[PDB]
Amino acid sequence: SAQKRITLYMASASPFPHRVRLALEEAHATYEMIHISLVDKQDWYQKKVYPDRAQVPYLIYGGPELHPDEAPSPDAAKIPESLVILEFLADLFPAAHLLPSDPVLRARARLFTTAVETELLPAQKAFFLMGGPPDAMLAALDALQARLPPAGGFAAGPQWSIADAAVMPILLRLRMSVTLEVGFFAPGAAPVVRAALESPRFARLQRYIADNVARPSMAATWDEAAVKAEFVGRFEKLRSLK
Amino acid sequence: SAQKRITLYMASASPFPHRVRLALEEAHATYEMIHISLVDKQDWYQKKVYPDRAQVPYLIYGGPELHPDEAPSPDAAKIPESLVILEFLADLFPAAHLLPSDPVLRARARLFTTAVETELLPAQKAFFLMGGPPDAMLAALDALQARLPPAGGFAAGPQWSIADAAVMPILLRLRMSVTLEVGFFAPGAAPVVRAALESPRFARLQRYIADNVARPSMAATWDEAAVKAEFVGRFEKLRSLK
Ligand SMILES: N[C@@H](CCC(=O)N[C@@H](CS)C(=O)NCC(=O)O)C(=O)O
């Protein structure tokens, strides 16, 4: 009946491991983390841990204590894909209500997550990686904001859910990128987005971000210095290979 | 009941409504269907039913009886997005076991579905809509086949699940398209894939298709003459608009 072992392979720059950390903290799970860098991928993580894709996040469920440069027990479950890991944690910790009980509100959470993955993330890539115009990024943020309940609350309604885990790491890193002006932005594009995100246009979205940041799971999982250092480091690597 | 009435806006040519129909039948659900043409779409669909996107499937849950050319009640729930609808039906009908009970096995089903949506469907689009080469389509089919349990059974294990509902409509339409050569295929590309699908390389996938077709839910959801008529009609219309 006691929880089986959880080990999470992660990193800081990407939004995807942060999603999982938020859900683990909201579940009050016991877990250990292992940071994966490119050297780890090349030297042992692809070989001993995750041969098919060597990506993070990657959750190991069951088995004995796990350290870097070690293969997981063949008897443990290995789960990739941040969104699937979120649904897994909601199934594993039912008393935490990481998804709501009502089936329509569960559908609402999943519709919100679908839109994050299929609409917001492509828009962020077009803006940050491909130097697209700020108006298209702000239109995607308008659409995201309109999917939040206008009467208040979290993405699926009054209660926090894995839908909030899915989007909050992206919003925090988007704000960081446009505030530090770190990215492959069209000229002047970052300030346009930064200023709009602080304006009355985005009052609802600002309230939503604040509501999520005020929860204990955010302080437990957001280390601004570490995220910045790896985010900027990744950008400088991208810039240099080019 | 008025609390639990299901009305499904659907069509025949697209795989997406079929996915939903498979799960409804596996759950032995009671439901009504409204047919939206994918050749000459009824203007009342966008105007009265689904103004934002006017896509099928669209599931209406609760409220009074609903007929064509009528707006759903404001008090009924409206659920788009086939993969979300499948998860919704698994939540509504727990006794049908549309997903397995164990969290790890539920993750297995969800990983299979994610690969359908993010790997197989993009490959089909590149091949059928954009005239891409047949080896890229075969690579995606090889990868799908390798995700199946080798000894037999369904996508997530011995029992049927919504992972099977996600993929089987695509496989049936792919086979039909390459067999009739109805699509925007490169010269020579359709026969390469048609022959491969019938060859020993794809024996495991053939057995999979046959095991799904043998279930009663297939005859209750797959009218190949109606699918083909709308599929060909839509293709010929699209081609004529260049
Ligand atoms: N992600 C959606 C995709 C739905 C979709 O693409 N529907 C198309 C099938 S052609 C549609 O309804 N199109 C309306 C139109 O083309 O006018 C799902 O899985 O339900």
* A84/B114 Cβ within 8 A: yes
DSSP state of B112: H
For residue B198, give both structure tokens: 């019938």
For residues A129 and A79, the answer to whether their CB atoms sit within 8 Å is no
Phi then psi dihedrals of residue B45, to 5 deg? -65, -55
Exposed/middle/buried for residue B125 (C-beta within 10 Å: 0-12, 13-18, 19+): exposed
For ligand 1, the distance from its centroid to the CA atom of residue B90, given in whole angstroms, is 22
Q: Is the dihedral angle over the CA atoms A143, B35, A110, B163 positive or is it negative?
A: negative
How far is C-alpha B9 from the chain's CA centre? Answer: 14
Instruction: State the method.
Output: X-ray
Residue/partner pairs of A235-241 with CB below 8 Å, 24 or more apart: A235/A182, A235/A183, A238/A184
Distance CA A165, CA A240 (A): 32
Q: How many CB pairs (< 8 A) connect A and B?
A: 56
Phi then psi dihedrals of residue A181, to 5 deg? 55, 40
The number of the ligand 1 atom at minimal distance from the alpha carbon of B80 is 20
Identify the three-state secondary structure at position B33.
strand
B34 sits in which H/E element: strand B32-35
Residue written as token pair 């910045």? A228
How far is C-alpha B233 from the chain's CA centre? Answer: 19
One-letter amino acid at B163 equals: A
Cα nearest neighbour of B109 on chain A: A84
Confirm or reject: Cβ of B57 under 6 Å from ligand 1.
Answer: yes
Distance CA B92, CA B5 (A): 12
One-letter amino acid at B91 equals: D
Taking alpha carbons only, the member of B22, B24, B71 closest to residue B48 is B71
B217 contact partners, CB below 8 Å, separation of at least 6: B22, B25, B26
Taking alpha carbons only, the member of A126, A46, A118, A9 closest to residue B84 is A118
SS (H, E, C) B182-238: CCCCCCCHHHHHHHHHCCHHHHHHHHHHHHHHCCHHHHCCCCHHHHHHHHHHHHHHH
Distance CA B183, CA B130 (A): 9
- The angle subtended at Cα B167 by Cα B116 and Cα A164, nearest 5°, is 50
Identify the three-state secondary structure at position B65.
coil
Distance to chain A for B191, nearest Cα, Å = 31
Q: Residue B1 half-sphere exposure, CB side, CA atoms within 13 Å?
A: 2
| Domain range annotation of chain A | 1-101, 102-242
For ligand 1, the distance from its centroid to the CA atom of residue B14, given in whole angstroms, is 7
For residues B23 and B89, the answer to whether their CB atoms sit within 8 Å is yes
Cβ–Cβ contacts within 10 Å for residue A148, how many?
A: 18
Distance CA B169, CA B162 (A): 12
| CB contacts, 8 Å: A20 with chain B | none
| CB contacts, 8 Å: A111 with chain B | 79-81, 84
DSSP lists the bridge partners of residue A154 as A157
What CA–CA distances, in Å, run from A200 to A154, A189, B230? 19, 19, 48
Cα nearest neighbour of B108 on chain A: A79
**Cis peptide leading into residue A103 (ω within 30°):** no
Q: Identify the residue whose C-alpha is closest to ligand 1 atom 8.
A: B55
| CB contacts, 8 Å: B84 with chain A | 107, 110-111, 114
Confirm or reject: Cβ of B16 under 6 Å from ligand 1.
Answer: yes
Distance CA A73, CA A64 (A): 7
Distance CA B238, CA B39 (A): 9
For residue A6, give both structure tokens: 């959880």
For residues A54 and A46, the answer to whether their CB atoms sit within 8 Å is yes
What CA–CA distances, in Å, run from B90 to A11, A118, B100, B222? 34, 23, 10, 21
Is A50 an interface residue toward B (CB < 8 Å)? no
Distance CA A177, CA A119 (A): 19
For residues B119 and B147, the answer to whether their CB atoms sit within 8 Å is no
Confirm or reject: Cβ of B55 under 6 Å from ligand 1.
Answer: yes
What CA–CA distances, in Å, run from A191 to A117, A185, B175? 25, 10, 50
Q: Is the dihedral angle over the CA atoms B112, B54, B7, B238 positive or is it negative?
A: negative
SS (H, E, C) chain A: CCCCCEEEEECCCCHHHHHHHHHHHHCCCCCEEEECCHHHHHHHHHHHCCCCCCCCCEEEECCCCCCCCCCCCCCCEEEECHHHHHHHHHHHCHHHCCCCCCHHHHHHHHHHHHHHHHHHHHHHHHHHCCCCCHHHHHHHHHHHHHHCCCCCCECCECCCCHHHHHHHHHHHHHHHHHHHCCCCCCCCHHHHHHHHHCCHHHHHHHHHHHHHHCCHHHHHHCCHHHHHHHHHHHHHHHHHCC
Confirm or reject: Cβ of B211 under 6 Å from ligand 1.
Answer: no
For ligand 1, the distance from its centroid to the CA atom of residue B173, given in whole angstroms, is 15
Q: Identify the residue whose C-alpha is closest to ligand 1 atom 2.
A: B81
Give the largest Cα separation in chain A, rounded: 57
Distance CA A36, CA B5 (A): 49
One-letter amino acid at A79 equals: I
